[PDB]
Structures are given as structure tokens and as C-alpha cells.
Amino acid sequence: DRGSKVVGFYQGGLRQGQARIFVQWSRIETPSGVVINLDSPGTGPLGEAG
Amino acid sequence: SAAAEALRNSINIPPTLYKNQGERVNILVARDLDFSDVYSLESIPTK
């Protein structure tokens, strides 16, 4: 549902010449208590990685 | 170079801190301190 909360994390920082950071989204909690582990890549608005 | 030699041999002298007596400090308690074996409470009778 909309308003479900997704929790992620990043690490390692950027190298030189890099302008995007890898984010992994880990879990999502539905407003009604449903919980699913989706260890999926986080992308930009058009699907570009990180 | 003699000057570079002297610098190389005396450049790493760690600093010294001086704190005067009577100054205020804190102690941030790092663990739970349990005082249950050395004190007990009792009510003082009225008058």
C-alpha cells in the first residue's frame, strides 16, 4: 500500500569520479503490518543505479 | 643537511596538558550502579 515504510542502508562511500552511491533497500512495512524482506537495489527516478 | 637532521630527530615531541587543581569535572556513569546491598529505607515515625 501507499505510505509503506522502506528501510535501507549504504556504506563504503564514493571513490573519485563517482557521483552515485549504492543503496540497498532491505525491508518494507505495510501500513497494516505486512513485512517482506526485499533486498533490492535502490535506483534513481528513471532507474539508474544508486 | 644538519638542520633537517635536527628537525628529523626532534620534531615528534608529544604535547603536555596542564589542568589546574580545583576545576570542575563530570563523571559519565558507564554502567548501572546497584546500591541494594548497602542501604535500606525506613519511615520516620511522626513526632
Partner: peptide, 26 residues
């Protein structure tokens, strides 16, 4: 005479708890 998953390697290493054991007064 005598007888005889484990990943998140850096963030999860930074989140390891520090558990200091309490003290009892004497």
C-alpha cells in the same frame, strides 16, 4: 621395631553493541 545474511559489513560492524556489566556497591 616399626610397623610397615551477514552483509552490511561496515555499518553492521559499527553497530555492534557495547555492553558494560553493572556494578554492585559494597
Amino acid at each position: 621395631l616399626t610397623a610397615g545474511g551477514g552483509g552490511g559489513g561496515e555499518l553492521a560492524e559499527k553497530l555492534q553493541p557495547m555492553r558494560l556489566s553493572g556494578s554492585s556497591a559494597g
